[PDB]
Design a protein around this ligand. Sequence first.
Ligand SMILES: C[C@H]1COc2ccc(Cl)cc2[C@@H]1C(=O)Nc1cncc2ccccc12
Lengths: 296, 300
Amino acid sequence: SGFRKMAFPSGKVEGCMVQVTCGTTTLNGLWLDDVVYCPRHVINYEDLLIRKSNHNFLVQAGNVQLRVIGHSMQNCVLKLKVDTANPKTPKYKFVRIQPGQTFSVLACYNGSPSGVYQCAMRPNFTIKGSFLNGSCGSVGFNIDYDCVSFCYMHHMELPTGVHAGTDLEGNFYGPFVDRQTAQAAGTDTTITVNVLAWLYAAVINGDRWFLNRFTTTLNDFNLVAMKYNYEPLTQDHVDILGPLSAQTGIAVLDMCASLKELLQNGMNGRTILGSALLEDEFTPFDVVRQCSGVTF
Amino acid sequence: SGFRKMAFPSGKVEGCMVQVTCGTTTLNGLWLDDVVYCPRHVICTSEDMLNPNYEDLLIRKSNHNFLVQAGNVQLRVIGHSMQNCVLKLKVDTANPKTPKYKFVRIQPGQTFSVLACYNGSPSGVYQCAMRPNFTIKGSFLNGSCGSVGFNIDYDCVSFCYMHHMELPTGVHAGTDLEGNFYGPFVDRQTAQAAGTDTTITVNVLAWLYAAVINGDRWFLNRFTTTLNDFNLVAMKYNYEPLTQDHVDILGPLSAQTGIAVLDMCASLKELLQNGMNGRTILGSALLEDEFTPFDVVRQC
Ligand SMILES: C[C@H]1COc2ccc(Cl)cc2[C@@H]1C(=O)Nc1cncc2ccccc12
C-alpha cells in the first residue's frame, strides 16, 4: 500500500553528468559515448559558436577534465565531441515526449547531481520544476528495462517560476526561445487522463468515497472538462485506462462521472490519497507500474 | 524558483542493492563492504511470523542456506550474525560500488529518500518523513522488505531506515541500520497498530517560509503569538508541540525572510482556523509537513 510521487532510480543518469564551462557560464552537460550535450546558451548562435575554439569549453567529469576535440550545434543543444567515451554510458535513446507524459528530473549544479524528482510536461509545455541558477543542462528521463530514454534538458525559468527546455535533439517543448526576451507560459490545463489514473490508484489503495453509481458519455464529460480547464479526454485515453478499469471494476466513463461530480461539488473537506486537490502528474502507466512493482 | 518534493540521487544506493533468499522468502539486502544487511524476518517460515524466536531460528541456519544475488552474480555467504532486528550476512566479496557511508538513527520529523526495491532491483525513488508516530507513509508492495531510507549530504550516504513491515492502516514500520525499530513495533505478525498521527509543526513552518521565499505571502498576518498560546491552539488540530529547539532551528529562515518565528506561528494558527479558502500554497491545498527546515534551506 501507499502512493507516492516516485521518480526512476537516477544512477544510470548520474554517471553521465558533467560540468560545462564556457567563459563565465557554468552549467550541466550530459556525457554519452564521446559527446557532451548541453544548452547552446552556454556560449546569433552560429556567429557566437564559430568564434569559440575547442579549448574554450572546459568539461569536468568528477575531478577529471575532459578534452573537447570538436563542437557542433543541433537546434538549441550544443554537442561537444570529447576524446574519451563515457565508460558509464548506459543503453539509451533520445525520445521526445507529449504533454501529459511524466519523467524524472535529475537536478544538477556544477555537474553534480543534487536531487531527483518526478514531474509532468504540462499541456502548456512547461514543467513545474524546482531549479535554481546553475541547474541548466539538468535532464529529464524515463527508464524501460535497462534503457534510459532522455526526453528533456533544462534551459530556462519563465517569469511565473515554471521551467522550459528542449528534447535531447535541441527542439524546445512549447513556444519558447533560448534568449532574454518577454516570454510567458500559456494558460495551463489539467491532464484529465492522469487525474483519472490517479483516481484508479486511489481506488486500488482503498479510497472509494468519490465513486458513484453514475456513468457519463465521452462527449458530455468533455463539455464539463472544457468548463473546468481540463484537457479533452480522447478515445485513446479511454483505451489506455482499460487495464485500470478492468482491475477496479470502474469503467472510464463511470470514473468520469466521479470526476465530473468532484469538479462541480469539490472534495467537501475530504482528501484522496492524502491530497485535497486532484493530482494530474501520474500517467496511467505510472499507476500500473507503482500498483504492481516494476523494477529497473 | 519552484518547490518540489525532492529525493536524493539514488545511484550510490542502487549499487548496494542485492536480493537475499532464505527458503521460500526473498527480500532486499544492502551490500556494504563485505556485509549484506537485511531484515532478520527473512529466516521466518509460515508458523514463525506470530511468535518467532530469531535466536533459535538463526542457530539452525548455515551459510549456504542464504542465497545472495548481486545482479546475475551469486555472492557466497561466509558468516552470519544478528544485530537486533537486522541480519548481517558476511560475504566473500567486498562491494566495489560501496560509497562513503554511515548509519544514522533519525528522529521523528526527519526526512529521507527511499529506494524501493523488489528482488534486489531498484524500481523507484521517493521522499519520506519519519512520522511523529514512528511510521513512514511509504509506497511498498510485497517483496519490498529490506528497501532502505537514506540521505546524501556531501557525497556520504547516511543510511537511516530499512523497511520491515506494513501495519494494517497501510503505513510502514522499520528499523535503523543497527536493527533497532523506530516506534513501539516488533517484527512479529501479532496485532500492532500505529498510534494517532500528528502534523510535524516545525516542518509546516519551514514550508511556509519556503512559500514566502518563493513569493507567496497571502497567508501572512499582522499578529504574533506566544509559544505557549501557539501550542495550545496547534495541539487542538493534532499538530506536534513546537519546542524552543524548533524555534531556534527556524532562526535562519526567519532572518532570510524577515518574519519572526512566532509571527509565522500566528499565520499558521490562522490557516488552521480558516483553511485555505480555495487558495494554494506552493501548489498544495493542504499544509505540507514533509520538508524539514534543513530541506527548505537546501532547496531554496
Ligand atoms: C509477511 C508480511 C505481513 O506480516 C509481517 C509481520 C512482521 C514483519 Cl516484520 C513483516 C511482515 C510482512 C509485511 O508486512 N510485508 C510487507 C511490507 N511492506 C509492504 C507490504 C505490502 C503488502 C503486503 C506485505 C507487505
